[PDB]
Design a protein around this ligand. Structure first.
Ligand SMILES: CC(C)=CCSP(=O)(O)OP(=O)(O)O
Ligand SMILES: CC(C)=CCSP(=O)(O)OP(=O)(O)O
Ligand SMILES: CC(C)=CCSP(=O)(O)OP(=O)(O)O
Ligand SMILES: CC(C)=CCSP(=O)(O)OP(=O)(O)O
Ligand SMILES: [Mg+2]
Ligand SMILES: [Mg+2]
Lengths: 230, 230
């Protein structure tokens, strides 16, 4: 249909709460979370969603323990090496990109990223964006900075700045669907936590109490049925 | 306490639904809505909230019928002439400002605005912002434009642009609490509808099904008790 969102974005959350309640380590909470992604992605592809964004890491998250953050970075490298490789080379023909401040990830993660982006570069199936070291304020600031540089070199005048111009300097300029139709946030909190900001003026929000390690294909289906009801 | 938000913002909504269900005119839905404001404002003042923002009109709302929009503009002039005058001159000593594209309101509304802003100019009680012809994308765009002009005149260089700089060119630069701690939206929809965007990265969202003509002091209390629970 057209009652199918073009862009769906997901804030993952609840991994430590989940660990805690399972009597298990937070690293294991994280790993079980990330293991969900591939099925979520496949399911969104089957539903004819054109873009799925999973938010994996904010700039503020670099304030957690070094050990926690390093474990996440490796779990993500592993995801991009096994799971994403499968997705891009499967019949789903998924296109992979990452957005965020990549300069800020270790070299090994940056390499995993460019490998999966190269591998999937010509694919024509659903776009999958992994937003990693991505923050909405930082995106806007960085847009404003690029536009200012262009102003400084006479390439652009101040009154040329409109939404559309602004939109082309954001990190979402890699899609024609920058603005999510549907934003899903697991684990019950009702806030954006410095995810997309510019990109959300008419996005439908969907909040579930479900902890993300428990979040599956059915939970995506549920979010979509809410969406179709609005 | 400090478990009292500094800034609370409210998206009003549900007036036509309410009219419809009361068998009454939408103009009357709107009037009964706006009549709620003064008690909401007084209550927020009593609770020690430092800033309340009520969003009265978006740029997209200029797409409704001319008659509807004109009725709203007059209802707002009346609010600023009777109710706000009382609030600013009462012991609550409320400070009034309006934000948004004021150029775009009729002259009579612009005059009501400057009169209430002058009247309350030296007050020291709670700040009350009426956001009228205000849209979050437009705010960001207009910020970016001012900053670009300043770049063009050598007043600012591109790498001087940071959050803080960005924040000082937004329409919320009239407060030291630009970012709401708590955002309330009546009538059940779960979206921002092009309200604040930059200002919301850590704002707590509170959605009530209550139609705004039915929204009173108790509903503000309820939103605050949810907030204190997060
Ligand atoms: S975060 P996280 O998803 O690492 O875990 P919690 O939100 O604290 O349950
Ligand atoms: C999805 C991740 C990367 C963003 C962080 S959600 P969080 O638990 O880090 O943020 P809050 O502390 O819940 O506002
Ligand atoms: S809008 P409004 O508040 O004028 O009315 P509805 O949201 O359509 O019920
Ligand atoms: C509070 C007012 C001024 C903003 C508009 S809320 P709305 O009913 O105009 O917007 P939606 O159509 O519900 O997205
Ligand atoms: Mg968390
Ligand atoms: Mg409405």
């Amino acid at each position: 249909d057209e009652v199918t969102p073009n862009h769906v974005a997901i804030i993952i959350d609840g991994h430590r709460k989940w660990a805690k309640s399972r009597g298990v380590t937070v690293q294991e909470g994280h790993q079980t979370g990330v293991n969900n992604w591939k099925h979520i992605i496949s399911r969104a592809s089957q539903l004819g969603i054109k873009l799925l964004t999973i938010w994996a890491l904010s700039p503020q998250n670099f304030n957690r323990s070094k050990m926690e953050v390093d474990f996440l970075m490796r779990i993500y490298e592993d995801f991009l090496r096994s799971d994403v490789k499968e997705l891009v080379t499967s019949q789903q023909d998924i296109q992979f990109s990452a957005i965020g401040d990549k300069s800020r990830l270790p070299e090994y993660l940056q390499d995993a990223i460019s490998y999966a982006e190269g591998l999937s570069q010509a694919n024509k199936g659903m776009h999958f964006i992994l937003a990693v070291a991505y923050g909405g304020r930082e995106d806007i600031v960085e847009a404003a900075r690029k536009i200012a540089a262009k102003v400084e070199h006479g390439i652009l005048r101040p009154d040329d700045i409109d939404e559309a111009t602004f939109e082309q300097h954001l990190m979402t300029n890699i899609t024609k669907f920058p603005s999510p139709d549907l934003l899903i946030r697991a684990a019950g909190e009702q806030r954006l936590s410095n995810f997309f900001l510019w990109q959300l003026p008419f996005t439908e929000f969907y909040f579930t109490p479900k902890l993300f390690p428990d979040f599956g294909e059915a939970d995506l289906l549920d979010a979509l049925a809410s969406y179709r009801c609005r």
